[PDB]
Amino acid sequence: QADRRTRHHMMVDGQINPREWFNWHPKEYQPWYFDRHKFLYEQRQYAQFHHLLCHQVYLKDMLHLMRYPEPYTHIIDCRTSTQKMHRWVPHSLWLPRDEVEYALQLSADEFLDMYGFRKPDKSDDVILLSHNGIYSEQAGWEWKKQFFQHVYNYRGGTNELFGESYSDMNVSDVLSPWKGPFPQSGVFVDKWSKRKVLTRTGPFDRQYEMQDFALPDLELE
């Protein structure tokens, strides 16, 4: 807390030296729409995985499968922390997220030995849950990595079913303000390009765009 100054060496250009060395150029980056309100994997940095997003099953589908279950629509819990689970979703099986990339590599007999329930067939419907729908989304990506044709995700599984207020506790790794990053300590590039990459135009909380080239606008004046 208390507004720690950060140990990065970014700086705005002064009022004395000319603007030079335009084979790198920082400018302010402003996109069209806000993405911070959206789901975490519906944001801007995950757009390329947009076709990898699992189809959504909703609350009413989950209540209908609670009341009237199907033999091959497998409800699977993807929550990892055993200290944060307090209730049982009906007709659910426990396959925690951090083991999924190993779990689908097993045979059916090894799946039965290492989890106590049968391995789902690749044509069976699989429905995944988590606290917010984040561990279930990564698990759905791991389930779609293998050739599983029908994989669905209930976004906000436990927190809407049981009414809890929990989270999957995703870190989203951001450097500590004592950790000095790469381009300050290094002779990987020449001194002009090193000074021109480390400069920015404005405060260092917003996003910027780095230009690899620039030509002078001779047609203005």
Binding site: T6, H8, M10, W24, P26, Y29, S172, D173, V174, L175, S176, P177, P181, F182, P183, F188, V189, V197, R200, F204, D205, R206, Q207, Y208, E209, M210, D212
Partner: peptide, 13 residues
């Protein structure tokens, strides 16, 4: 370092 989209440096690097 030389990426076209530059985040804040605590999360970019």
């Amino acid at each position: 370092t030389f990426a076209s989209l530059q985040n804040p440096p605590e999360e970019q690097f």
